[PDB]
RNA sequence: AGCGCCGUGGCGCAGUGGAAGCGCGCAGGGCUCAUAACCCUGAUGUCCUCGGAUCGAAACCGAGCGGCGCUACCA
């Protein structure tokens, strides 16, 4: 069963933003549902519902696809939403549209851990996944987090241990990527030897490549060579990289030459 | 279906390479020049003409450098003519 | 049913294949056509020159098979900068039988010592006569110091003329020019175009070609009708290059030198650093023969400015890691030859333009760098490379107290401000360093319509020198 | 005694231009008589002319209103770049390939040119 | 050669993960005395190729093809 909010509460706030998917359009505009935020209807009607002139009706409407929105009015008696589309600027549609794919996407995980254990989907949102959302600021990097940590989990109360076994699972199936640092360094040498400096460089180098981030540095050009590793913390590449380049410093200040850095490490 | 008309003896046929300004067009004629043509009275603003359609037009003996539209051929008489080969038929035009 | 490359292979090896040098031969009895020295090296330079877009590289490609590349983007089409190369073995064929004219044939260096005749009707075999190596000089108004570097690298010339253009082509004779001032006197002429010519128009462009030189110092220089396209006429050529050009005066006796003229540096990418080569340099030896493990110096090497401006010059010390000539790696190299000299030079110091015109020493000598050359220069009367509409050519004008001038000293590209101009004299301060061994050739060029023209020559007599920091 | 003929063989272009359409059903005959594919041709005419066409059967439709005069004046142009050999007056060069870019080369002599953009 | 990309419905873009997308095109009718502007509605695609994970790939990735911008012709 999909169903079940994304967000706290069941009822949108005031002035808040969210994404929500047209259906229908009768006279006055149209109520549509919403995908940011539970399922109930919220009407634009049609004052608020072009920027420029009301030209074309249906093909900015476009039935039965998504499209950003904000919400001006709640009436917390019965469910009713008042809800607007031009009054979102060209700044703040993207962040919309990006807390809108957040949000979908921790949907699905916790979706299928609903539908095996056969919990409702509520239970799930209330137990681990808005702590989260409150701990990170959002579910989605609680999730990368816990790709990195397992400590991120702790302090959560599951409705079985066999639900984060699983869930555990599905996300180092699902979530995984471990960006990739690349660097690029200037040999700049006048020198005498340069060829065994710089094998011995490579040497220094790559003896410094654990088992879960191996350095490389392979040969694109004479003077500039690029430095490739894939850090899975993001924390740990620059200093190895900057290890790589202490090395090679070591390494070319004695051999008479010299050597520069074009581009330090970075993601 | 108004019958067409063939040339006699100094009228000839030709193709508007494009059409001047003023009241005037350029009539590629089918003896290998590029010359220039009046639109003539009985045919200046009811029939208009077309760049790139057969039309007859009529040499004068005096100058050779210009001549006068007389006729024009609604691409019909024009495919027939080329059917039967009043013109040279490497440059043909249809639609 | 065998495969065309097996039916090569077994031509190599009945051929004579490629032998390998003895690692210790006597030396004093080592002559530049010896076997050891002609069929894995090419003892003799041939150089082409002409005027921009007419196809040099196509006459050197269809004689020998060797491509110049062309490469770098925008230069596959327009120009070149770097010189073109490429090996040829000339064989003769040993069977007075088959007619002389076709008897020579150039071919590939990979090819084996005595390849069969490829005559219809005549089974002997190929004598190599000599192995040559091909200089192609980009023929461009822009282009000026490479020309004349090359041309100093140059032993015998070959000039290009088309047939349909216009007959006195200012390049051409530029060219003939600066190769009578470097002391190259065997020129070969060639009529590129003669298939698109009649039979009255060649005569006329011949008669033509004759009016021009006769003035020159060149005077009874062959001409050669060719096709660089239709790849005819080359056996002749061969005959030509055999006949015309015999070996310059060239022993051991003379001390050890090299002049690099290119940079070359081997650093595939995609490949592990654990697994690399040397810097190379592409140099002309005209004088000392280079084996394995010798150490070498590049004088004027590392060039950099003190904090008050001055110049040091800190000399590149060398190991010789290889030396790469022809296909193969060879022991010794023969000195008049184009040679890739892989030491362990940084590979940075060698990435495109940086080793171009530079003196280098076997140790042993201590060649010096001067600050200051005092030249003996002379001119000529008229420039050459410009075309006048129907006027007198351009006149040249005497030097004038601190101007900049192209001065190329052989190889060495620097630029010269003059401080007095004499009768006979000159003096020249250089940016650039540049060291002088025994007299060296130069050649002058001054800036007035835009880009270098040449001038004259010019000649040191003595200069200002700087003691190089070890 | 090899070559003992030594274009004026180019087809009379035939424009055929039904109102807002335009119609080159003669394509196929130029492609051949020049020795050059009709992809690269209409590609080159999409490229002189900016708009899009489609190919039936051989013939090439375009929805636009043009000349036979731009027409001949294109078809030249790229006779005289792309059919016609500059350094030589020879029609047998074809369209080749030599790492990633578009190399025509020569048949009757044999030359390395490049006439891409 | 390696890198930074791309692979279209006729052209241009796009998300890549729930699986045919929009404008520009063009056909048709609509407004108009009438044309253009503007309305609305269509018939067409291996989102390049082989695989592997996946309830699911056009999408995440690899092993390959073609087109590119550099690095640079890199004995
Ligand atoms: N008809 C004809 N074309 C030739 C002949 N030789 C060369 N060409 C062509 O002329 C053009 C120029 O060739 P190219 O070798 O690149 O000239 P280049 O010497 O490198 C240019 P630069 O003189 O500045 O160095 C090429 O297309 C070539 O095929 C010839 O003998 N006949
Ligand atoms: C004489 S071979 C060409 C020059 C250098 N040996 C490289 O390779
Ligand atoms: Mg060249």
Redesign the pocket.
């Known amino acids: 069963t999909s169903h079940c909010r994304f967000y706290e509460n069941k009822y949108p706030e005031i002035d808040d933003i969210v994404m929500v998917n047209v259906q229908q359009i009768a006279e006055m505009g149209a109520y549509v549902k919403l995908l940011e935020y539970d399922n109930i209807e919220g009407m634009i009607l049609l004052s608020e519902l072009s920027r420029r002139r009301i030209?074309?009706?249906?093909?900015?409407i476009?039935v039965g696809?998504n499209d950003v929105a904000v919400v001006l009015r709640v009436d917390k008696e019965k469910g009713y939403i008042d809800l607007s589309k031009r009054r979102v600027s060209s700044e703040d549609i993207i962040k919309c549209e990006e807390k809108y794919?957040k949000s979908?996407?921790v949907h699905?995980?916790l979706?299928?851990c609903a539908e095996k254990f056969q919990i409702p989907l509520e239970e799930l949102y209330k137990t681990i996944a808005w702590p989260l959302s409150r701990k990170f600021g959002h579910a989605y990097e609680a999730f990368k987090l816990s790709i990195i940590d397992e400590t991120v989990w702790e302090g959560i109360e599951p409705p079985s241990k066999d639900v984060l076994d699983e869930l555990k699972n599905?996300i180092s199936?699902?979530?995984?990527?471990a960006v990739?640092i690349?660097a690029d360094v200037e040999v700049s040498c006048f020198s005498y030897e340069g060829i065994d400096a710089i094998k011995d460089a490579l040497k220094s180098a790559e003896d410094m490549s654990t088992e879960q981030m191996q350095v490389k540095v392979?040969?694109?050009?004479?003077?500039?060579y690029?430095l490739?590793t894939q850090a899975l913390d993001k924390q740990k590449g620059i200093e190895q990289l900057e290890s790589a380049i202490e090395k090679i410093t070591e390494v070319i200040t004695k051999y008479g030459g010299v050597c520069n850095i074009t581009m330090p490490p970075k993601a | 279906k108004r019958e067409l008309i063939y040339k006699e003896e100094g009228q000839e046929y030709a193709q508007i390479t494009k059409m001047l300004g003023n009241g005037r067009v350029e009539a590629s004629c089918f003896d290998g020049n590029k010359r220039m043509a009046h639109i003539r009275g009985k045919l200046r603003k009811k029939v208009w003409m077309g760049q790139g359609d057969i039309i007859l037009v009529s040499l004068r003996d005096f100058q050779d450098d210009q001549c006068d539209v007389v006729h024009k051929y609604n691409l019909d008489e024009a495919r027939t003519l080329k059917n039967q080969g009043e013109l040279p038929e490497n440059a043909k035009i249809n639609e | 049913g065998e495969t065309e490359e097996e039916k090569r292979k077994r031509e190599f090896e009945e051929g004579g294949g490629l032998p390998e040098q003895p690692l210790n031969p006597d030396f004093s009895k080592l002559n530049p056509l010896s076997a050891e020295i002609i069929n894995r090296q090419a003892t003799i330079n041939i150089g082409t020159i002409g005027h921009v877009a007419h196809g040099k590289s196509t006459v050197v490609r269809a004689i020998s098979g060797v491509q110049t590349?062309?490469?770098?983007?925008e230069?596959?089409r327009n120009i070149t900068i770097?010189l073109g190369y490429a090996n040829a073995k000339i064989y003769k064929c040993q069977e007075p039988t088959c007619p002389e004219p076709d008897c020579y044939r150039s071919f590939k260096s990979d090819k084996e010592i005595s390849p069969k005749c490829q005559r219809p009707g005549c089974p002997g075999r190929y004598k190599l006569v000599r192995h040559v190596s091909f200089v192609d000089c980009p023929g461009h108004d822009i282009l000026m110091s490479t020309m004349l570097s090359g041309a100093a690298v140059m032993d015998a010339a070959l000039l290009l003329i088309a047939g349909n253009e216009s007959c006195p082509q200012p390049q051409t004779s530029e060219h003939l020019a600066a190769i009578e001032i470097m002391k190259l006197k065997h020129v070969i002429i060639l009529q590129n175009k003669v298939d698109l010519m009649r039979e009255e128009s060649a005569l006329e462009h011949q008669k033509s070609i004759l009016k021009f030189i006769r003035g020159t110092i060149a005077d009874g220089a062959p001409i050669v009708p060719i096709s660089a396209q239709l790849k005819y006429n080359i056996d002749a050529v061969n005959e030509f290059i055999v006949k015309t050009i015999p070996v310059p005066p060239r022993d051991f006796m003379i001390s050890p030198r090299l002049i690099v003229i290119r940079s070359?540096?081997?650093?595939?990418?995609?490949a592990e650093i654990e697994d690399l080569?040397?810097g190379?340099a592409?140099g002309s030896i005209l004088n000392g023969v280079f084996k394995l493990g010798d150490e070498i110096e590049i004088r004027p090497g590392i060039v950099t400015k003190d904090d008050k401006g001055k110049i040091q010059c800190k000399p590149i010390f060398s190991n010789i890691?290889?030396?790469?000539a022809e296909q193969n790696?060879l022991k010794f190299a023969v000195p008049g030859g184009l040679?890739?000299?892989?030491?362990k030079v940084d590979?940075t110091l060698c990435?495109?333009?940086r080793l171009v015109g530079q003196v280098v020493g076997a140790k042993g000598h201590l060649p010096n760098i001067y600050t200051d050359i005092e030249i003996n220069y002379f001119l000529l009367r008229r420039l050459l490379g410009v075309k006048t509409d129907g006027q007198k050519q351009a006149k040249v004008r005497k030097l004038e107290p601190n101007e900049v001038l192209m001065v190329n000293i052989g190889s060495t590209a620097t630029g010269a401000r003059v401080v007095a101009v004499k009768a006979d004299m000159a003096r020249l301060q250089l940016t650039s360093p540049a060291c002088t061994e025994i007299n060296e050739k130069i050649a002058l060029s001054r800036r007035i319509e835009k880009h270098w023209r040449l001038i004259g020559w010019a000649t040191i007599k003595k200069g200002t020198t700087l003691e190089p920091i070890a | 005694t090899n070559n003992p003929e030594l274009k004026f063989r180019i087809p009379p272009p035939v424009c055929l231009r039904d109102g807002?359409?335009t119609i080159f059903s003669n394509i196929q005959d130029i492609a051949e008589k020049l020795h050059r594919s009709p992809e690269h041709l209409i590609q080159y005419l999409?490229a002189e002319l900016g708009?899009?066409?489609?190919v039936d059967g051989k013939r090439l439709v375009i929805?636009?209103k043009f000349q036979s005069k731009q027409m001949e004046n294109v078809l030249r142009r790229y006779i005289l770049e792309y059919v016609t050999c500059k350094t030589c007056k020879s029609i047998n060069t074809e369209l080749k390939?030599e790492?990633?870019?578009?190399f025509m080369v020569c048949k009757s002599c044999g030359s390395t040119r490049s006439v891409?953009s």
């Open positions: 030209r074309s009706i249906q093909k900015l476009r696809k794919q979908k996407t699905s995980i979706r299928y599905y199936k699902r979530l995984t990527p990739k690349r392979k040969l694109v050009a004479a003077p500039l690029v490739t | 590349v062309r490469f770098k983007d230069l596959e770097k070359f540096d081997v650093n595939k990418p995609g080569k040397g190379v592409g890691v290889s030396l790469f790696d040679i890739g000299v892989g030491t590979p990435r495109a333009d | 807002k359409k999409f708009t899009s066409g489609s929805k636009g390939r790492n990633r870019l578009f891409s």
